[PDB]
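Example 3.
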Amino acid sequence: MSLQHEKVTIAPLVLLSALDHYERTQTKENKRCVGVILGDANSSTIRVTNSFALPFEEDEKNSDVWFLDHNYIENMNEMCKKINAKEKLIGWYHSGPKLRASDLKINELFKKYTQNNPLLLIVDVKQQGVGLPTDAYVAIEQVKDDGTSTEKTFLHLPCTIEAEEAEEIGVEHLLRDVRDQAAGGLSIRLTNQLKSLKGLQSKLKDVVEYLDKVINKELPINHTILGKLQDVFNLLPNLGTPDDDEIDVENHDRINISNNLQKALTVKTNDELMVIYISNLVRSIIAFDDLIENKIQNKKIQEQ
Amino acid sequence: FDAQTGSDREVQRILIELLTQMDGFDQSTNVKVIMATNRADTLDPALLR
Amino acid sequence: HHTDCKFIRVSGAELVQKYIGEGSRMVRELFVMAREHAPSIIFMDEIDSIG
Amino acid sequence: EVKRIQSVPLVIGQFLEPIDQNTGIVSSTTGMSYVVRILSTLDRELLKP
Amino acid sequence: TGRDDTKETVYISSIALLKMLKHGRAGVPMEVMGLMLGEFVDDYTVNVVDVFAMPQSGTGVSVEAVDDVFQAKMMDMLKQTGRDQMVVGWYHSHPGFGCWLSSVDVNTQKSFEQLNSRAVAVVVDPIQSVKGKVVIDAFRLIDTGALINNLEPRQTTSNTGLLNKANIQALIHGLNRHYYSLNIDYHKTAKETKMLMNLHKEQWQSGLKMYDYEEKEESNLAATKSMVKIAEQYSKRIEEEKELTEEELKTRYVGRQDPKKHLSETADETLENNIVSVLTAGVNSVAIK
Amino acid sequence: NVKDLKASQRVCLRSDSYMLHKVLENKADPLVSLMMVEKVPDSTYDMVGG
């Protein structure tokens, strides 16, 4: 037991494997690919190193019916310790994108192969999101506030793709595209800055909609969200304080340095111009010489 | 100067090279090497100077 | 300087080379090396302390 | 791409002399005397010694 | 006659590339074994869809280096999940040596030829690969009867005929008396590419994210001084620089490792950086409040 | 060719079979490396007095 899952690093091996595995069972139409994920666990950083399918069925008539083969999980463990003992079961991927309550009960099962709470790694294989190709959640059991019972629930814990070093080599090989976002030159980051504003703006739009549905359509108040929003209003920049004024002075400080640099280049660019005109000057003379030199050549043929 | 067995000759070699290299060639942009000694009885006869 | 040749010098003992191989035949082969870089002046120095 | 080769891991060697601007001769610390190509836009104004 | 005997285009999927590198690099300084599972179609097309790693062997790669207990069990597990494919080859590493088959590895290929006579043998160096295009080559045997009577070449018809090869060493000797090499072709879809490109939502969130301004001032400070010091270096360049032959000027006034180019790069990095910083700041002001 | 090749001619070679590349008329010797730092003297008859 430990509640340690604060950062989830994903190897790119896991996201492409989940892409294959969905298609090697051929699940569709809110049928799911449930397999295991292995890695290291019982630790502050989880590294999700590997993924495998398991036998699994998903019934659409009742979501409390699914199949799972237990004997498969025991036999796969024996094998993987021989390849690598740094690999152990750390929880399960689920194809998603929809998280359900019956998935808490699948969760309980996986809590009998790993000491830590199992990690349920939602990998969207349908590629509907333009960001989040990983969202990670861990089941924890806690008394929920506002007269509410003890609920078993899936809380979001930070995840990011970071890649192993051994993985990296192949990531470099398969990416031969120009990369619209890669953090390049002036050009690459002006495309980014625009992209970044529409990113945030849409994220902000979900918050508006959510809030409306709480008091219109009576969504359950989840006071965690609402607490975070109090701090949103409390970290708002307020104008007319000496801080904002110093920031406008700093925009001139920075543009000041940009101006000196721009002049310095104007001398390089003019240096290049000067140097071509010298070449062209010479070339006028060389072309003139050919005309004289012909006469000298013609005269020899006649003589000899 | 000794060279009784081979092992007297090795100490000697370090002395030779120190002197020659000391010396200026291109001339020194250093302060010229500093050395310390409990006594000068166990230095060379005249090669320090 | 006035001679107009390659004043190489060579400082100290010449058993000192050992990092590509020993200095117990670069004395000998010095004959050859010097010949190649003609016209060349070898200042093989050794102040002597062999007694 | 070149930046990666430029960076670690590396094996140290020792520049001897050029034999051509774009091929030089070195000796490695593994013990092998190798003729090696010199990547351009390296300081060749200190490489020659 | 008989077999076509033209060397396959091996299409290794993205999953199978990365998996091989994963098992190889953990295992250095040692050899690794493994079986390659795919589908064979056409008369010269093998698609290696997936792989599995055979545990580390105590005698190294050999003809005993597949245990039949692991093998049978491992394929049985793929059959319960529908991921099943057929052994169409085998992979092995030399961890410190580029691609070729030793005497033992060729003899292993003779065994895999029995089971499937279009089999591939892929040699992956895990550490020598920094591109990941390089030091992965596939080999397939050409018939023995073909060797003797000099009907050996027949791999140049029914391919692109663009070949990629290097080394004499073991590699070439291996080639003449046994096998034929052909490059590794990489197959992918745009769903695998799409997954790689994303690296969370913090990829784009960071464009708005602004560093300490303590850092910006420091970077801009260093750069200002740098341009003066390289302007002086450039002043020496134009000290006269009118004597004959361009090449003798390049060496003399340090036109090699040019001070004009050096000034140019220095200016541009700083100019553009401060451009984004002013822009992101201004974005922040108007957007929040 | 064997015609171009003389005895005492320094030659460049490969690692895969040691096949020749180019003749070299340069010579890398432990003597050469000592010369190379020092270079020529600046001395003249009158730098030395008496």
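The interface with chain F takes residues 167-169 of chain E (CB under 8 Å). DSSP finds ten helices and eight strands in chain E.
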